Write a protein that binds this DNA or RNA. Sequence first.
RNA 1: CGACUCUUAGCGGUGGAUCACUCGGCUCGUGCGUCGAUGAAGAACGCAGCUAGCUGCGAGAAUUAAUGUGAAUUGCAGGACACAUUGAUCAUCGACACUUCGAACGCACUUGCGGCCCCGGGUUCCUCCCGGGGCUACGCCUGUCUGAGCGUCGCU
RNA 2: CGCGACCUCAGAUCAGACGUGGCGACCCGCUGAAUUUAAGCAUAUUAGUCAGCGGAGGAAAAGAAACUAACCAGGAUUCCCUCAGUAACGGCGAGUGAACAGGGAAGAGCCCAGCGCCGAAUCCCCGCCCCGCGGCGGGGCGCGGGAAAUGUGGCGUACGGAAGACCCACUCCCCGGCGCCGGGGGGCCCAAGUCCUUCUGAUCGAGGCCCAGCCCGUGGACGGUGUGAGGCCGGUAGCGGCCCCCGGCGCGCCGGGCCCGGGUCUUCCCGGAGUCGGGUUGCUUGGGAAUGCAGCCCAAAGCGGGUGGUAAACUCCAUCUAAGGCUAAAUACCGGCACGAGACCGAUAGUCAACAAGUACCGUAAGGGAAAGUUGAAAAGAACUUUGAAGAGAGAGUUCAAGAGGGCGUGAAACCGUUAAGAGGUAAACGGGUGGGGUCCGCGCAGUCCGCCCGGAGGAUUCAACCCGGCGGCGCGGUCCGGCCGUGCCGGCGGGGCGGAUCUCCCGCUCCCGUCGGCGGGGGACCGCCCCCCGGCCGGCGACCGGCCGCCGCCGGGCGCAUU
RNA 3: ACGGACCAAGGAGUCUAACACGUGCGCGAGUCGGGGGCUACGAAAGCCGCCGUGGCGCAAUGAAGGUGAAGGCCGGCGGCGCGCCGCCGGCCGAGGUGGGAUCCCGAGGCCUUCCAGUCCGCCGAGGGCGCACCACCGGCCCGUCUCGCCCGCCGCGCCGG
RNA 4: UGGAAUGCGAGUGCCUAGUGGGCCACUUUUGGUAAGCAGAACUGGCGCUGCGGGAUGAACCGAACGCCGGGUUAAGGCGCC
RNA 5: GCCGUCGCUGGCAGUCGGCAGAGCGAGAAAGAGAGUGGCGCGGACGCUACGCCGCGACGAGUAGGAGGGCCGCUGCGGUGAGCCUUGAAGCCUAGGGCGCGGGCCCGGGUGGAGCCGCCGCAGGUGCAGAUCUUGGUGGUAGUAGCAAAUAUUCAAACGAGAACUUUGAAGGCCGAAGUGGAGAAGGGUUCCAUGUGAACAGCAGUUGAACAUGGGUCAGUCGGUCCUGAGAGAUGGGCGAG
Lengths: 158, 134, 258
Amino acid sequence: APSRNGMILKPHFHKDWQRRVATWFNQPARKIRRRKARQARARRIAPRPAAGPIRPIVRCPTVRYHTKVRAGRGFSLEELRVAGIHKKVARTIGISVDPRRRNKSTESLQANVQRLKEYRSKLVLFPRKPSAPKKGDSSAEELKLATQLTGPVMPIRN
Amino acid sequence: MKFNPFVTSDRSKNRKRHFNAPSHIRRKIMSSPLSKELRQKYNVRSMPIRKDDEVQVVRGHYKGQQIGKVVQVYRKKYVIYIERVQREKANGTTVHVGIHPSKVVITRLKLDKDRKKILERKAKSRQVGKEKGK
Amino acid sequence: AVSELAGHQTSAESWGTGRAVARIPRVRGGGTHRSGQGAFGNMCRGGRMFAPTKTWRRWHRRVNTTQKRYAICSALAASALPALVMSKGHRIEEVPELPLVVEDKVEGYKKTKEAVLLLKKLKAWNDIKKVYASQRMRAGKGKMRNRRRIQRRGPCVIYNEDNGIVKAFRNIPGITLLNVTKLNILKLAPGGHVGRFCIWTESAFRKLDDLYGTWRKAASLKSNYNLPMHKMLNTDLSRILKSPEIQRALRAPRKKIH
RNA sequence: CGACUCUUAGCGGUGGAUCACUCGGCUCGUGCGUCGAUGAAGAACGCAGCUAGCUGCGAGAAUUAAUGUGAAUUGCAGGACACAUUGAUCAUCGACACUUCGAACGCACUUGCGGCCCCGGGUUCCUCCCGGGGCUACGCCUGUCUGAGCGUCGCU
RNA sequence: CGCGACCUCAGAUCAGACGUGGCGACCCGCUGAAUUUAAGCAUAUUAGUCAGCGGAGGAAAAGAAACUAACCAGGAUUCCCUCAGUAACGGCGAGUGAACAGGGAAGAGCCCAGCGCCGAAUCCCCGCCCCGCGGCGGGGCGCGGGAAAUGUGGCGUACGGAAGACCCACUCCCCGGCGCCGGGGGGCCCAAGUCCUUCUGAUCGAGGCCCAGCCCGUGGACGGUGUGAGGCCGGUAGCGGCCCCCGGCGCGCCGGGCCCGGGUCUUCCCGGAGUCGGGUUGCUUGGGAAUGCAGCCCAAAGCGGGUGGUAAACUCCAUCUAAGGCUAAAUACCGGCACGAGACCGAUAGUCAACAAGUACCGUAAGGGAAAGUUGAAAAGAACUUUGAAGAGAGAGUUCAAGAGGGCGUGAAACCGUUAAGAGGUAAACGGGUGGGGUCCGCGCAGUCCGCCCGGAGGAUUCAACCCGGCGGCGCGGUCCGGCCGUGCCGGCGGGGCGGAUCUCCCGCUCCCGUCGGCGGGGGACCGCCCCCCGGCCGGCGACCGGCCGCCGCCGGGCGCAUU
RNA sequence: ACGGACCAAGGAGUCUAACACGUGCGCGAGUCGGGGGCUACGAAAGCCGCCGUGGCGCAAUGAAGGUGAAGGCCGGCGGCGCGCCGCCGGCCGAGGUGGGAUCCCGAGGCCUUCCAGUCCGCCGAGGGCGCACCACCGGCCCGUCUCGCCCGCCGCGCCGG
RNA sequence: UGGAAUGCGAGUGCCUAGUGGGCCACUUUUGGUAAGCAGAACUGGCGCUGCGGGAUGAACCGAACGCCGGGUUAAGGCGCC
RNA sequence: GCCGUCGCUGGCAGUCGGCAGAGCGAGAAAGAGAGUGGCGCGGACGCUACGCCGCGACGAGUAGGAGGGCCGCUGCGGUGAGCCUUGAAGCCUAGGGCGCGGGCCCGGGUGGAGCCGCCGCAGGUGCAGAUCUUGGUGGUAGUAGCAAAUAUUCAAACGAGAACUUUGAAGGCCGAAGUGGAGAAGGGUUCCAUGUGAACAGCAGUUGAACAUGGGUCAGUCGGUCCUGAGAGAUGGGCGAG
Ligand SMILES: [Mg+2]
Ligand SMILES: [Mg+2]
Ligand SMILES: [Mg+2]
Ligand SMILES: [Mg+2]
Ligand SMILES: [Mg+2]
Ligand SMILES: [Mg+2]
Ligand SMILES: [Mg+2]
Ligand SMILES: [Mg+2]
Ligand SMILES: [Mg+2]
Ligand SMILES: [Mg+2]
Ligand SMILES: [Mg+2]
Ligand SMILES: [Mg+2]
Ligand SMILES: [Mg+2]
Ligand SMILES: [Mg+2]
Ligand SMILES: [Mg+2]
Ligand SMILES: [Mg+2]
Ligand SMILES: [Mg+2]
Ligand SMILES: [Mg+2]
Ligand SMILES: [Mg+2]
Ligand SMILES: [Mg+2]
Ligand SMILES: [Mg+2]
Ligand SMILES: [Mg+2]
Ligand SMILES: [Mg+2]
Ligand SMILES: [Mg+2]
Ligand SMILES: [Mg+2]
Ligand SMILES: [Mg+2]
Ligand SMILES: [Mg+2]
Ligand SMILES: [Mg+2]
Ligand SMILES: [Mg+2]
Ligand SMILES: [Mg+2]
Ligand SMILES: [Mg+2]
Ligand SMILES: [Mg+2]
Ligand SMILES: [Mg+2]
Ligand SMILES: [Mg+2]
Ligand SMILES: [Mg+2]
Ligand SMILES: [Mg+2]
Ligand SMILES: [Mg+2]
Ligand SMILES: [Mg+2]
Ligand SMILES: [Mg+2]
Ligand SMILES: [Mg+2]
Ligand SMILES: [Mg+2]
Ligand SMILES: [Mg+2]
Ligand SMILES: [Mg+2]
Ligand SMILES: [Mg+2]
Ligand SMILES: [Mg+2]
Ligand SMILES: [Mg+2]
Ligand SMILES: [Mg+2]
Ligand SMILES: [Mg+2]
Ligand SMILES: [Mg+2]
Ligand SMILES: [Mg+2]
Ligand SMILES: [Mg+2]
Ligand SMILES: [Mg+2]
Ligand SMILES: [Mg+2]
Ligand SMILES: [Mg+2]
Ligand SMILES: [Mg+2]
Ligand SMILES: [Mg+2]
Ligand SMILES: [Mg+2]
Ligand SMILES: [Mg+2]
Ligand SMILES: [Mg+2]
Ligand SMILES: [Mg+2]
Ligand SMILES: [Mg+2]
Ligand SMILES: [Mg+2]
Ligand SMILES: [Mg+2]
Ligand SMILES: [Mg+2]
Ligand SMILES: [Mg+2]
Ligand SMILES: [Mg+2]
Ligand SMILES: [Mg+2]
Ligand SMILES: [Mg+2]
Ligand SMILES: [Mg+2]
Ligand SMILES: [Mg+2]
Ligand SMILES: [Mg+2]
Ligand SMILES: [Mg+2]
C-alpha cells in the first residue's frame, strides 16, 4: 500500500534473484592476478613496450564525442602503404594493423602517417642474428641503451 | 610473527596435525634437550629421543638428580617409560609412569651409525648459521 | 553467513487441524526419533533461523577522500600534545620532546638490539614494558577463533625509506611501523581515539609539508589539497573571557541566592 | 503432643540446564582443475594371531616391490630387528598385482548352458572325462578376404 | 555358358583403431510449467524459470562484420562501469525492458571451397635396414598393396589475388635428436633460561638476575608440554644451508628440411541456393504493419544481395559481401584435489551428521532418516578385610579431590525422600499495616573525633633574622641584550620552483620555387602564487624563548642555644 | 469465550535494492573514483587528474519539429499625424509595496558642595537602511490563443525574426 | 485616549504511527405493542480510567490518580455487621 | 516534606586577593566613570559548564509516538602497568546492602581456568503464553488393570531360594476337519548341547524362541537346472528433440 506522498517506484525483484546474485568479494583477489600476469607479460616481452603495439590516432563518431580523439585498433593498410611498411611485416615491429578502417579525410591520414614516422624513428630494432648485425637494425650502441617503455607508447593527448 | 602464506597459524589445525601425526613425525615431535655437558661438545640443543638413552627428569613429581635408562618410547601416547620412574598399583605390582620428552634432559646418547649422522647434520647447519650471522 | 540449505534439507508438511498438535510442519513418517517432530521455523529444534544471514550484507564502507585526509590531519595534530598522548595511556613522562625526531642513520639498523638500545636511550622503554605488563589472554569465544592473545598498542614509528628498520623493529611487541606516503588512520588512531605516541625520523618529518603543506602552500605530493581551515583561531576562551575588551561590556554578576 | 498437609532451610536422590572446553561445521579467498572397454563410479563378497564396526586392502587381500626415514607396533600375546653382507616403524609411491556384478562384453541371469584354440593328467591323436590358460557382446572407421545382382558394360 | 572390369550391396572371432557409462558447481543444444502478482481472472507476470532430455571442457560458448553509424566517422569476440530503470513492450494495468556511443581488463589473427596453374607434383597400409625407443616417430629400401582424376598436394580467399616483363633487395626460417650452460615438487637441518628464591598436586605462576639494564630476536605466529612458556619441544624469520627429481629458458654439433622477397607497369580471374527473399502459421523478443527462430507453400538475382528501428512506390546516397571452417587472453565455477583465513556457530547451535552418520531405524519400493562430545595430569580404574547367593553394602587404599568411581567436569529448575523450625475447619496464594519467633549481621555493649587557645608536667640539636649555592614565578627591565615566528605589512642593480585558454629564436614535417608560407617542439618574455636571501617597520613568543638586571617564593648548606 | 499440568533451553519487524523526509559530517556551483590503474594484520591503507569517462547539480518548456529565462532615460535620422514607430551613437543601471529579527543615527538624560567644561561608556523620544521569510502587484522563458503592424537578406519565400 | 468586557504568547512548516466493528446516559427524536430492539441529533461518559458512595455493578452521584504527614470536604451516611 | 517533567528560551567563567578591597533584590530608561576651571603576609565550598545553582506550575492512560537508561546479552578496535590456582566462569545461599525500576554490589559455600570496568563498533541480543519446538518431571496412582477358549492335586529331586523348573503318581483337556504327525510361502540359526541369571519373557522362574560359549543342513535317482503356458523381451524395421 502506498503511503501519503512518494514515488511510484518499480522494483525489478519479481524473479528468483537470490539464486543469481554476483558478489565482488574476489575483486581484490583478481586485481592481484591481473597485475601478476601483467608483470609476467612485461617480463616475457623483455624490451618490447609493456602496453603493446602502437595504436593510431582516431576521431570518434556521434557528435557527442566527435571533437575528442582516441586510440583506434590499427593503422589502415592505406596509411601503411603511404608510410611504406608492408602489411605483413608491420605486425612484427609492434605496429597495429586492422584492414577494416577506411580513410575518407586527409587531415587524419597524414596525422597517422606522421605517427608512423614518429614510431619508426623511435624504434630500436635488435638484429635477427645476435652474433651478426644486419642492414636495417639499430647498432649495438643503441641496443645497450634500449629499455622497456612503460605505459602506452606515444600516448595520445587532446 | 610468521609470514609464510602456506603455514597454518590456526589453532585447531595444529591441534589436529599434532594428534593425527604419523609415527615418523611423532619421532621428531618427541624430541628432548641435550644436557649442557653434551651441548658444549656437539653444538646441538635437542635430539629426537631414542630408546637406550640415559635421561634425567626435571619437571613433575619425579623430578630430581636420579638418572635412568629410557625403557621404552610409547610414541602412540606421546610419552616414554624410564627405568625407575614407576608406581605401585593397589595390589602391589609396579607400572612405569610416563614422562613427556619435553620435561626430561638427556645425559648420555646411544650413538648409532645414524645418530652420528643426525648430530653432524645439526652441527653442520649450525656452523652454517653462525657464518650466516657473523 | 550460515548455509542457504540449512534447516530446509528435510521434507515436512503440516498435519493440519485435528490431532491436537500445534500445526507446525512435521517430519514425514519414519521409525526414528526425528519422526513427526517439527521441521522448519525458528521455534523448532533443528530448523532454520529467523532471517538467515546472507553474504550480500553491506560489509564495506566508503569515505570521502577529503574526509579521510581531514581525519589524518586531525590524528596528526593530536599527536603533538602531551595531554592527548598521556591520556591515551602512553608512558611519556620522560620523553625530551613530543614530536620525537631522530637522525636518518636509524634506518640503517638491522639488529633488534640497536632498536632496544635506542628505545631505552629515548626513555621510550616504559611503553614496551607496559605492553609486556598488558599482555594477557583474551576473554570469550575469541580465544578459539585465532584471537587468543591480546595486548596494548605501543608507540608508532614513522619512516621514509625501508633500509631494514621494519626488519629491525618488527620483533618488539607493540611497535608498529608506518611509511609517510601511506599513513594509515587505523594505525595512527587505534581504537578510534586520537592521541597515539609517534616517533618520527627527520627525513619523514621533512616530507609532511610536501604531503599536506601549510595553508598558503598547497600539497605538492597530492593533486589538490590544502590543510582544513580553522573554525576558531584563539581557542583559549579563558584568555578571551577575562579580557578587558569583553570584560568591560558586561553587567555586574547577580551572584546572590534568593 | 501423634498422623497428614503447607512453607523456609539443611543434606540426599531423578534430571542434566548453565559455564568452561572443541581433531566439527559455515562462509570467503587462492592454486590446480585429472574418470572409463589398458574395464570408471557404485554394489556384492572376502582378508587381522586374538576382529564385530569403522578403515585399509583383494586369494600377493589391515597390504607386495622400490625409495626416504632410522628403531619400533602395542590392548595382550607372539614375531622380527649386528641398525653395516644390512634396516623395525611410518611416509612417499614411479614397479607388480588388483575376487564377482557393474558402460560390463559368448547366451541368460538361476549361478544355468555353450562353441573354438592351446597345455597338463586321461589317453598314449581315442575320441572320451577332469583340471589350467587364451578367445567368442553391439555399433562404427581404414584396408584385407569371400561373395550377390534379367545394375552398367567389354571380350569370348 | 564362361571370363574381366566398374557400380551398388552383404558376410567375417578378418589386421589395426574408435564410441558406450559416471560426475555435473560452472558451460552448450532442445523441452518446458504451475504455485505467486494483477487485491477476482482469462492476455501479461512468475518465466524461457523449476522439473525433464542430450553434449563437453578446465573453462565452455562466441569470435575477425551480409556490423555500428549518419560523425571531422568507428572496425573480431568476451567482460566491468556508464548509457538505464532509458528507448520500447504492456487488460499501455500489474508490471516488464534492451542497444549505440564513451571510459576501462585483455588484445592476434586467420583458413578453405570456388576461379587458374602446375606430367597426382598428394595421402594411407604392409614387408625388410638402422636408430629413437614409458605422448609410436626420423631416415632408407620394396616392377609391395591400396585411396584418389566423381579431384589429392603447393600458390592462393575478398585486406584483392594470379601470370609475363622492368627494377631493386637479399641466407635465416622450421623440426628431430646428441651434448653441455644457471622456475616447481620432495627429504633433511640451522638463536636464546628449564638461570636463582618462592607459590602448586604439577608449573608455563610471583619476585630477582649491576654498569653487556638475565640471554636470543631478520625468530615475541601458533601448537604441544601436569594451570598461564620468545628462551622445554616442535616450529616461526631468513635473496638461510645441504641433498634428490621434474621443467623451462641457453649454447655448440649432426642428419634433415626450405630454395623463397618486395616496387613499378602489362595481361588476366574473382566466390558458398530449396539458400536469401515473400506469403502464412506457432513460439520468443523492448523490437512496436512481424527482433529472432521454426513448420508449410512460392522461389530468385549478380553494376547483384542484405542492412540504414513505420507498411508501400520512385529516386538518390551510406554501409558491409550472408547462405563454408578454425582461433589463445581478458570471463564463469555452492562438484573434485590441495591450501589459507574469519568482528561467523560453539554440541537443542554449527552440515542431517564434532561420535562405528547418510549409520541405527521405518517403508514392498521411490524415499524418509535420527539420538549420541567431556573420569583424571597420569588409570594411578578401589589390592586387601568383611556381610550377603548375587546385585549390593561396611571398612581400607589411589588422587589435590571419588564432595571425579568406567554415560564418571561443573551438576541449576521442576519432582521426590529425610532432618530442623513453625503453622493448620471457610482451597491455596496475594497487597497495606503491624506484632511474635527465628536466622545470621553489627565482630555492638560504656561509646564520636577534629582545629584553636589556656594551663599542667617532659623531649629536641629547633624558630625569627642574616650568609652562601641551586631552582622556579613575574617583569609596562616605561622602551635591557640577542634570538625565533607571524593564515603580517612595503621595499630589491636578488635567486629558484609550480601554474597560465597572456604573448613571441631554433627544430620535426607540409604545399608551392635553397629561397618562400601554414603547423607538430623547447626556449624566451610576461602574470599569479609559493619558497629562499636582502633592509624597513609592525606585532607575538599565553599552542612558539635564551642571557644579565630587579622583586618575590622554595629547598639545601651554614649562623642562631632557645622566654623561640 | 479460547490457549495454559509443571520446569529447563531454543523462539518471532531481519538483510539487500529503491524512494521520501529528518538529522551529523566533508567539500560546496560544484561534487564523487564506487570501475580501472600505480605502489602477518593487509582482501587493509595510500596514491592517480591528460583516469571525472559517467552520475547527480548547474534550465526549463513543447507530443514534436524546436525555441530557451529585467530594462530605462538621452540625443540625432526616417515614417505616421504632439506623441509613437523603427535606426544608429550616449549614460544609468537587475523590480516595487506591506510586515520584518538585526543594525545604524540620537532630542534629552544617567548626582554627590557649585558652574562651565572634553573624552569614555550606557539609556532613550523620534528617524533610517532593512536578513530570512510571508502576502500582493509587476517583469522574464517555453507551449497555446486573439488582434495587428514592421524588419532581415547568398538563395525574396508556403522564408526568417 | 490602540476606540466593548474577561482571559490567554502566538504564527508557521515538514515527517508521521495507530484508527476507520463502538456502546451507554440527560434532552429531542424515526420504525416497532414493546424490548438489555433497530436508527438519528446535542452534550457528557465507558472504551483508554483508578478512587469514595449506590450491598453488589463498564456507563449512575461525587470526583479524576507521582510517593507521604496533618486538617477539611463532596456524593453518601451515623441501632450492629 | 520528598521524586520527577515542564516553564523561567532563568542565574554562575567574578575563585576579578598586599599588582587585594570582596557589592549588584532593588519600585521608577541609563556610570559605586575619568580627567578640566571656580604590626601581624591571612580569607570555607564551587566549575565532570554535556557542570552546578534558584524559582514557580504541573504528574492518569489502551492503540500509537518520542526520549533517557552508570538496565542486561554476545563478539570487535582501543584503554584499565585491569582481576585470577593465596581460586576465574558457573551455580546455591534464613548473610550485609544499593537503586522507583530494569538491575547491581559485597559475605559464605560449591567449583576448578579463565574473566571483567570504561570509551567507541557490531548484532541471529532480553520471553509466560503461540492446541509453540526439544528434553526432563509431577497429581491422577500403588489406581485402572494383569478375567475369551472347563483344572488342577500330592510326594521327591536340583537349588540360598519353588504355586510356575524336572521326575513319578492322580485327576483332566485336545478327541483324528486335533492342542497330533509332516511340507509350500515367509522367517534365517529361531535348530542341537553346555553354562549364566544383568536386561527381557506385562507375577515368579532353578526355565525360555533371552544371554554367553561351541556344534550342526552331505544326493547321477529329492527339487532347481531343461521345455513351453498366459505373458515379458532384443535384433531387422518404424517412430522419436532426446
Ligand atoms: Mg497505511
Ligand atoms: Mg539449524
Ligand atoms: Mg554432563
Ligand atoms: Mg559464557
Ligand atoms: Mg574378521
Ligand atoms: Mg614391505
Ligand atoms: Mg620407504
Ligand atoms: Mg531361470
Ligand atoms: Mg490474483
Ligand atoms: Mg490476494
Ligand atoms: Mg484465485
Ligand atoms: Mg499470462
Ligand atoms: Mg520475459
Ligand atoms: Mg523454447
Ligand atoms: Mg533443471
Ligand atoms: Mg539424463
Ligand atoms: Mg557423456
Ligand atoms: Mg576432463
Ligand atoms: Mg571454443
Ligand atoms: Mg570478412
Ligand atoms: Mg560494439
Ligand atoms: Mg560502444
Ligand atoms: Mg588496458
Ligand atoms: Mg591451402
Ligand atoms: Mg584446389
Ligand atoms: Mg619468572
Ligand atoms: Mg600450552
Ligand atoms: Mg608458548
Ligand atoms: Mg622469558
Ligand atoms: Mg627452532
Ligand atoms: Mg626451538
Ligand atoms: Mg623460513
Ligand atoms: Mg513454450
Ligand atoms: Mg513472453
Ligand atoms: Mg588475512
Ligand atoms: Mg546437542
Ligand atoms: Mg546437549
Ligand atoms: Mg552443553
Ligand atoms: Mg546437531
Ligand atoms: Mg544437552
Ligand atoms: Mg568435579
Ligand atoms: Mg581441565
Ligand atoms: Mg558430576
Ligand atoms: Mg528437603
Ligand atoms: Mg515439624
Ligand atoms: Mg479461538
Ligand atoms: Mg487445555
Ligand atoms: Mg531462552
Ligand atoms: Mg513518507
Ligand atoms: Mg539529508
Ligand atoms: Mg541517471
Ligand atoms: Mg475492522
Ligand atoms: Mg445491535
Ligand atoms: Mg442502540
Ligand atoms: Mg478497556
Ligand atoms: Mg476496544
Ligand atoms: Mg480520554
Ligand atoms: Mg470515569
Ligand atoms: Mg442497590
Ligand atoms: Mg502519567
Ligand atoms: Mg533458596
Ligand atoms: Mg572439586
Ligand atoms: Mg552471532
Ligand atoms: Mg518459557
Ligand atoms: Mg487393581
Ligand atoms: Mg486374555
Ligand atoms: Mg470338547
Ligand atoms: Mg502339527
Ligand atoms: Mg513335529
Ligand atoms: Mg516379569
Ligand atoms: Mg531351543
Ligand atoms: Mg550311494
